[PDB]
Design an enzyme around this catalytic site. Sequence first.
Site, PDB file in Angstrom:
ATOM      1  N   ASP A 130       0.818  -1.210   0.000  1.00  0.00           N
ATOM      2  CA  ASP A 130       0.000   0.000   0.000  1.00  0.00           C
ATOM      3  C   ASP A 130       0.853   1.261   0.000  1.00  0.00           C
ATOM      4  O   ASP A 130       0.586   2.212   0.720  1.00  0.00           O
ATOM      5  CB  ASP A 130      -0.969   0.003   1.171  1.00  0.00           C
ATOM      6  CG  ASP A 130      -2.166   0.904   0.951  1.00  0.00           C
ATOM      7  OD1 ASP A 130      -2.420   1.363  -0.186  1.00  0.00           O
ATOM      8  OD2 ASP A 130      -2.889   1.125   1.942  1.00  0.00           O
ATOM      9  N   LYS A 132       1.956   4.729  -1.114  1.00  0.00           N
ATOM     10  CA  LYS A 132       1.290   5.878  -1.707  1.00  0.00           C
ATOM     11  C   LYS A 132       1.648   7.104  -0.875  1.00  0.00           C
ATOM     12  O   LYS A 132       2.140   6.968   0.249  1.00  0.00           O
ATOM     13  CB  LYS A 132      -0.222   5.677  -1.735  1.00  0.00           C
ATOM     14  CG  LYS A 132      -0.848   5.394  -0.357  1.00  0.00           C
ATOM     15  CD  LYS A 132      -2.338   5.216  -0.458  1.00  0.00           C
ATOM     16  CE  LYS A 132      -2.947   4.830   0.881  1.00  0.00           C
ATOM     17  NZ  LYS A 132      -4.431   4.741   0.817  1.00  0.00           N
ATOM     18  N   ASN A 135       0.899   7.492   2.787  1.00  0.00           N
ATOM     19  CA  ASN A 135       1.612   6.585   3.682  1.00  0.00           C
ATOM     20  C   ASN A 135       3.106   6.859   3.733  1.00  0.00           C
ATOM     21  O   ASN A 135       3.864   6.054   4.265  1.00  0.00           O
ATOM     22  CB  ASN A 135       1.369   5.125   3.288  1.00  0.00           C
ATOM     23  CG  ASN A 135      -0.002   4.650   3.667  1.00  0.00           C
ATOM     24  OD1 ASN A 135      -0.659   5.215   4.554  1.00  0.00           O
ATOM     25  ND2 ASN A 135      -0.443   3.609   3.012  1.00  0.00           N
ATOM     26  N   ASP A 148       2.173   2.529   7.772  1.00  0.00           N
ATOM     27  CA  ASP A 148       0.990   1.733   7.369  1.00  0.00           C
ATOM     28  C   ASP A 148       1.360   0.308   6.957  1.00  0.00           C
ATOM     29  O   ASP A 148       1.281  -0.075   5.793  1.00  0.00           O
ATOM     30  CB  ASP A 148       0.153   2.445   6.273  1.00  0.00           C
ATOM     31  CG  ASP A 148      -1.299   1.948   6.196  1.00  0.00           C
ATOM     32  OD1 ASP A 148      -1.799   1.394   7.194  1.00  0.00           O
ATOM     33  OD2 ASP A 148      -1.943   2.122   5.128  1.00  0.00           O
ATOM     34  N   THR A 170      -4.623   0.227  -2.539  1.00  0.00           N
ATOM     35  CA  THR A 170      -5.378   1.412  -2.882  1.00  0.00           C
ATOM     36  C   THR A 170      -5.444   1.436  -4.407  1.00  0.00           C
ATOM     37  O   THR A 170      -4.463   1.279  -5.048  1.00  0.00           O
ATOM     38  CB  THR A 170      -4.704   2.660  -2.299  1.00  0.00           C
ATOM     39  OG1 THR A 170      -4.661   2.584  -0.882  1.00  0.00           O
ATOM     40  CG2 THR A 170      -5.447   3.892  -2.709  1.00  0.00           C
TER      41      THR A 170
HETATM   42  N1  LIG Z   1       3.689   8.258  13.266  1.00  0.00           N
HETATM   43  C1  LIG Z   1       2.943   9.325  12.975  1.00  0.00           C
HETATM   44  N2  LIG Z   1       3.312  10.619  13.129  1.00  0.00           N
HETATM   45  C2  LIG Z   1       2.469  11.601  12.760  1.00  0.00           C
HETATM   46  N3  LIG Z   1       1.255  11.360  12.250  1.00  0.00           N
HETATM   47  C3  LIG Z   1       0.804  10.113  12.045  1.00  0.00           C
HETATM   48  C4  LIG Z   1       1.646   9.002  12.401  1.00  0.00           C
HETATM   49  N4  LIG Z   1       0.995   7.866  12.115  1.00  0.00           N
HETATM   50  C5  LIG Z   1      -0.203   8.219  11.593  1.00  0.00           C
HETATM   51  N5  LIG Z   1      -0.303   9.571  11.557  1.00  0.00           N
HETATM   52  C6  LIG Z   1      -1.453  10.337  11.061  1.00  0.00           C
HETATM   53  O1  LIG Z   1      -2.627   9.775  11.628  1.00  0.00           O
HETATM   54  C7  LIG Z   1      -3.511   9.343  10.586  1.00  0.00           C
HETATM   55  C8  LIG Z   1      -4.287   8.121  11.028  1.00  0.00           C
HETATM   56  O2  LIG Z   1      -3.399   7.021  10.905  1.00  0.00           O
HETATM   57  P1  LIG Z   1      -3.915   5.519  11.097  1.00  0.00           P
HETATM   58  O3  LIG Z   1      -2.767   4.608  10.712  1.00  0.00           O
HETATM   59  O4  LIG Z   1      -4.549   5.456  12.457  1.00  0.00           O
HETATM   60  O5  LIG Z   1      -5.124   5.435  10.033  1.00  0.00           O
HETATM   61  P2  LIG Z   1      -5.064   5.513   8.416  1.00  0.00           P
HETATM   62  O6  LIG Z   1      -4.104   4.466   7.881  1.00  0.00           O
HETATM   63  O7  LIG Z   1      -4.878   6.955   8.003  1.00  0.00           O
HETATM   64  O8  LIG Z   1      -6.607   5.198   8.072  1.00  0.00           O
HETATM   65  P3  LIG Z   1      -7.224   3.852   7.440  1.00  0.00           P
HETATM   66  O9  LIG Z   1      -6.849   2.795   8.454  1.00  0.00           O
HETATM   67  O10 LIG Z   1      -8.695   4.184   7.423  1.00  0.00           O
HETATM   68  O11 LIG Z   1      -6.547   3.687   6.098  1.00  0.00           O
HETATM   69  C9  LIG Z   1      -2.612   9.109   9.368  1.00  0.00           C
HETATM   70  O12 LIG Z   1      -3.339   9.240   8.140  1.00  0.00           O
HETATM   71  C10 LIG Z   1      -1.519  10.136   9.551  1.00  0.00           C
HETATM   72  O13 LIG Z   1      -1.823  11.354   8.862  1.00  0.00           O
END
Ligand SMILES: Nc1ncnc2c1ncn2[C@@H]1O[C@H](COP(=O)(O)OP(=O)(O)OP(=O)(O)O)[C@@H](O)[C@H]1O
Lengths: 284, 9
Positions: A130, A132, A135, A148, A170
Amino acid sequence: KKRPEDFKFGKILGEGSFSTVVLARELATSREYAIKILEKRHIIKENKVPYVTRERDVMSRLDHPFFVKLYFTFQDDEKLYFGLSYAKNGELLKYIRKIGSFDETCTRFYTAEIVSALEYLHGKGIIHRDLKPENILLNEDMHIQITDFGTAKVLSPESKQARANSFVGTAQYVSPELLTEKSACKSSDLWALGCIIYQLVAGLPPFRAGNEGLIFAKIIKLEYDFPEKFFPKARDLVEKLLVLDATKRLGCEEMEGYGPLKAHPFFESVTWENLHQQTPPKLT
Amino acid sequence: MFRDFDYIA
Ligand SMILES: Nc1ncnc2c1ncn2[C@@H]1O[C@H](COP(=O)(O)OP(=O)(O)OP(=O)(O)O)[C@@H](O)[C@H]1O
């Protein structure tokens, strides 16, 4: 073993479908972490346990400067917690949108970091699946931090496994082999890299449509074109990545790996050693 | 479950 009371939680950094990421400060050390929190009841109800296990297992294997680091996990009666490095500058996608199109220097630098990261990941026998711009996060110093991993796959070295069968990804970045053969391989991430390079230069990824089925039809036909002024050596590289036959993509195992990819003319001026210690070019 | 979840780098 850490506990929730070891932290002071601050702002929400982001929300996913079944998770919330919160900025937290560890009381004993004053360090900042991004803590991803999931509700057990919800993940159990919605069949997401394997994705949570996978994210933990894959991240525990990674130790490279271009990846978000998993420092710890813990739990209480209601929740699971992942303590992650905080990528203060957010998603790469935000910058593509803000600026519209990266210049050649910036395209080269960020592409090189992604290639370096993929070299590391693939050397560990892990497929991201995934990849992109959403991520690919950015740290305070504007180096990449790939994230991710709940849909990533560790290929079994014991069986010399090359292909993975879960349907994940995606639509804009999904490989033709996953659509047609129903499996992905390391080279599937090279397809996504091609899409990303195209997007950095063009402003949008190459296979575009208002719904997934239309995107899939374009992918399997290699139906895309380049805009005018697309940097010629970058175009050549994209054309060597967006190849329907996964065994013919520059960087894949059947094309003899990352050496030939890193030797592409688009990267002539890149110093691959210590990229993570070089000052990134300003995005403008 | 989640018996094998806790982790410390
Ligand atoms: N390590 C980090 N530092 C800063 N921001 C982060 C970090 N990890 C995630 N985020 C932010 O938090 C958001 C939510 O992340 P999370 O992995 O919980 O869900 P997601 O992968 O965005 O959503 P989905 O699971 O629906 O695809 C991310 O899209 C990112 O913008």
